[PDB]
Design a protein around this ligand. Structure first.
Ligand SMILES: [Ca+2]
Ligand SMILES: [Ca+2]
Lengths: 314, 133, 95, 111
DNA sequence: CACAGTGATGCAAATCAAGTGTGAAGCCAGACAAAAACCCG
DNA sequence: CACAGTGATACAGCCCTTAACAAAAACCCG
């Protein structure tokens, strides 16, 4: 059975056909045997409805790098609900079987994450924010906000994590650069304009329940959990004497556009810890409610003004 | 570790010796020899098949990587610039130095020269252009 | 005016190589059983090893044997199951 | 093995009134042994006996573990098959060669 | 002696270069063997 | 007029073949 023996014999079998193909190539293309044989085999694959193998062959005849950048791997790992362990399992399996790296390792994704997370882009407020630091590299600030946890002080039995409000807004605005650019381009507006954009944000806070407590060492935390999030709703610019709606969320009730701000483990009716945790956020909000943000996206420094609205409250 | 001859082979070897001794200056063509043994095999073979077979028991006693991707890869280093700038010097001064010993020499030269700006700052600028492009 | 072989389209290349196609298919199904694709990739591997490009021949053998740059359905099924992927999420991932 | 699962919510829609419980039924091979020469020797024993990766599910139903009537009505065919198979031998092709199998049933995964 | 994961954090191992000249495993012209699996003798 | 899924089924869509014709885009020459 041919296509199963070794060499020096399958040749001896196909010698006549090989010399005929050589004569045909010399008569047609003067001896371009490689290209004509490649074309013949491609059409032979296409005849039997095997487009996959033929496409793989015509792609490898270039010999090219079919490697995914770490951004695509991160998007796949996030938007498909994959834990890091299962992703690593899939990564090692594909690499060991296919003998190459279609996907990127974990450290590349970790390094790429540091761009989307807050505390990575520079910015500054032209009116300085009262009682708010101007540093622009803070990440996950502790939720307790330096609350006194001594034995004489009022007892503390809650844990919390959260970002800086202004840094979160900067990161959210920098995430939607392409959308704002496309909105300005579509509404017959020059992209290099840097007018005083106006941003409206919807806030929300709810108290969850039935969250199981864990074992181990630490403070005796309760079971009721509370979160606090926001959402960029609409943006306008003052062009002439109008307000062009450059961007509006098409699904204002989807979980894909509700960006988190703060987490905690406390009762909603516990008025003491609730205020002790939410005081810095309200402070930053009231502070930045009388200023304007400037930052450079697309190579042009812009201008922003916020008008917040709190409606996601039962 | 290689192959061996056969009965048929150690008479073609005698013919090879013959047509290489008749004129040991024109061993260029094989087609003539291809039409030479056609008559030599058409007697005087047992004494040669013996030494041919004599080698029967004698001879019986003896990664996937990348495929040419784009080339924003591996910007050169300070030591690489030092090599690229000082290997041809020692090469023209001493051609017999294979780059094993020549590279050991260039390295022990670099291992004696104290550290900088033409190498390290240039490498940093190259890496900066590397991360962007 | 002739320009080059691979510069043509698929139908034009078929029109241009119909004669060689018929000849190879008939001289392959006379005595060699009739597997056209077998003789095709065999002749291509021979003409490619004439240029001693071991790498390209090994890659083509891997493609046509299913062992690299492309997964057999059992392996990707095992990946889709043992990683707890859904049918829509795997679809998005495959899309 | 077998166990009853509580707290299994019911869905809307059409169909019979399904109770808010669940009962499973599974099995697991332990050790394969061949009779070679004059004694026995094992061929394949389970390395991880309590692992979930070797708990093959067999039967699934949504009923109370105390509903004796429904439980017996569901599990009687399986027990009949088990009794019928406890005195037979299987011919099966492995690698292109027929093989002989005989089973020894043991039920221990019962609280 | 349940167990298959959860994350980050850290350390250890591969690599990878850009320089460089030599060394080495196929490939070719025919072509008569060297077995070797078929016919049945 | 929340909204993202969730696995199986059906059908449109888009590839493949033969077969003579028939139109489209160019270079020698007049
Ligand atoms: Ca609630
Ligand atoms: Ca139970």
């Amino acid at each position: 059975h041919l296509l199963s023996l070794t060499r020096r014999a399958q040749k001896h079998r196909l010698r006549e056909l090989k010399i005929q193909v050589k004569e045909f190539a010399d008569k047609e293309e003067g001896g371009d045997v490689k290209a004509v044989c490649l074309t013949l085999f491609l059409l032979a694959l296409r005849a039997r409805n095997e487009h996959r193998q033929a496409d793989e062959l015509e792609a490898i005849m270039q010999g090219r790098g079919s490697g995914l950048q770490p951004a695509v791997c991160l998007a796949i790992r996030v938007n498909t609900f994959l834990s890091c362990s299962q992703y690593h399992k899939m990564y090692r399996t594909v690499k060991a079987i296919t003998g190459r790296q279609i996907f990127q390792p974990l450290h590349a994704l970790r390094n790429a994450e540091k761009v989307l997370l807050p505390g990575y882009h520079p910015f500054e407020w032209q009116p300085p924010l009262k009682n708010v630091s101007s540093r622009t590299d803070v990440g996950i600030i502790d939720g307790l906000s330096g609350l006194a946890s001594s034995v004489d002080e009022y007892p503390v039995d809650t844990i919390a994590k959260r970002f800086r409000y202004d840094s979160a807004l900067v990161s959210a605005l920098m995430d939607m650069e392409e959308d704002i650019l496309e909105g300005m381009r579509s509404q017959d507006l020059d992209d290099y304009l840097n007018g005083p954009f106006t941003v409206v944000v919807k806030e929300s806070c709810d108290g969850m329940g039935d969250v199981s407590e864990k074992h181990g060492s630490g403070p005796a935390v309760p079971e009721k959990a509370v979160r606090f999030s926001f959402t960029v709703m609409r943006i306008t610019i003052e062009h002439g004497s109008q307000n062009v709606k450059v961007f509006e969320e098409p699904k204002p009730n989807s979980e894909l556009c509700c960006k988190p701000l703060c987490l905690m483990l406390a009762d909603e009716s516990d008025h003491e810890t609730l205020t002790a945790i939410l005081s810095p956020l309200i402070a930053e909000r009231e502070a930045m409610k009388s200023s304007e943000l400037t930052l450079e996206m697309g190579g042009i420094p812009r201008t922003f003004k916020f008008i917040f609205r709190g409606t996601g409250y039962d | 570790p290689r192959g061996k001859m056969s009965s048929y082979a150690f008479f073609v070897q005698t013919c090879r010796e013959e047509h290489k001794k008749k004129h040991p200056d024109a061993s260029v063509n094989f087609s003539e020899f291809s039409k030479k043994c056609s008559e030599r095999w058409k007697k005087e073979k047992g004494k040669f098949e013996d030494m041919a077979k004599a080698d029967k028991a004698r001879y019986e006693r003896e990664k996937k990587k990348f495929k040419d991707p784009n080339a924003p890869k591996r910007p050169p280093s300070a030591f690489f610039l030092f090599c690229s700038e000082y290997r041809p010097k020692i090469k023209g001064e001493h051609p017999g130095l294979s780059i094993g010993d020549v590279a050991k020499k260039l390295g022990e030269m670099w291992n004696n020269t104290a550290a900088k700006q033409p190498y390290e700052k240039k490498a940093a600028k190259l890496k900066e252009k590397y991360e962007k492009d | 005016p002739r320009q080059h072989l691979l510069s043509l389209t698929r139908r034009a290349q078929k029109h241009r190589l119909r004669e060689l196609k018929i000849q190879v298919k008939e001289f392959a199904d006379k005595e060699e059983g009739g597997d056209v694709k077998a003789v095709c990739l065999t002749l291509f591997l021979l003409a490619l090893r004439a240029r001693n490009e071991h790498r390209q021949a090994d890659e083509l053998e891997a493609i046509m044997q299913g062992r690299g740059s492309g997964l057999q359905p059992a392996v990707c099924l095992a990946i889709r199951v043992n990683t707890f992927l859904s049918c829509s999420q795997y679809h998005k991932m495959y899309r």
